[PDB]
Symmetry: C2
Subunit: 162 residues, 2 copies
């Protein structure tokens, strides 16, 4: 049976946090963070559902200083649903949303070992004939001593319209 | 010597995360989250510094659906600097920022056991003669099973201008 796509709600916050946590690899925010996103940012976020389980999430916001830029924060797809095109469908759903009107750039950061995200963003640009630019973003050394976190290179997609 | 107040930067992200973590009580987001706030949201955030240490932080954003409302996310003051008026000075600094122009409401959520925040927001409204309204916000049951998190009642301050 099919995968369903919708805007999240504050009450999804806990299941979103579970998804992110079960991924193992991703930077995990507080459950409250996911509720706020469900509440205040849900016009520019996306959930994927299959047989009533959350199997995908994208969080994004429009940059407050430069609202023509959408920043994509997290992309998560459950293990059990890899390689079925879900990340690509979320991102495409998201850019179709009415709250993405007037956006001319996508901006995001992709960790070295996140190869799905690298593929998603480069492929999105390539399939739509939009420029993509990759530069130094945040360095590993900006992260706290206890952990060992990777670099977060910056990806800018565009200009385009909408 | 005095406490200094400024907008944060992406490179403060790690020290902000340390402050939040050392507080013990607060919902801790990922270091990356604090960097994004330093980067994309810093016009509506605030740092407090004393003898080059971070001793206070406020995070906020303008609601994307209702940009006349500022939502205040986290308020943190280091243990060692309680009861010296820092939270009040941050919040007052923040509302003076040029990116708070045209704001007519403050909205936030305060946990039951966070008595400093309760005092800050109720006192801010009372000192400025602005209405304050308190209602049910997020319930404890919306949080994940493993933890035991409290309610987050909603505080709305206003209308006012600016
Ligand atoms: Na354009
Ligand atoms: Na007003």
């Amino acid at each position: 049976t099919e995968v369903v796509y919708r805007r999240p709600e504050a009450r999804d916050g806990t299941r979103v946090w579970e998804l992110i946590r079960d991924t193992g690899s991703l930077d995990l925010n507080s459950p409250y963070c996911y509720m706020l996103l469900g509440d205040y940012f849900n016009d520019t976020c996306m959930i994927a559902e299959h047989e009533g389980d959350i199997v995908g999430f994208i969080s994004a916001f429009r940059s407050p200083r430069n609202p023509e830029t959408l920043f994509v924060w997290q992309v998560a797809v459950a293990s059990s649903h890899r390689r079925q095109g879900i990340a690509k469908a979320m991102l495409t759903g998201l850019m179709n949303q009415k709250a993405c009107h007037g956006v001319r750039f996508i901006e995001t950061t992709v960790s070295p070992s996140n190869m799905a995200s690298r593929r998603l963003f480069l492929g999105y640009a390539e399939e739509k004939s939009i420029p993509s630019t990759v530069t130094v973003g945040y360095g590993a050394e900006m992260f706290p001593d206890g952990t060992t976190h990777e670099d977060e290179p910056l990806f800018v997609i565009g200009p385009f319209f909408n």
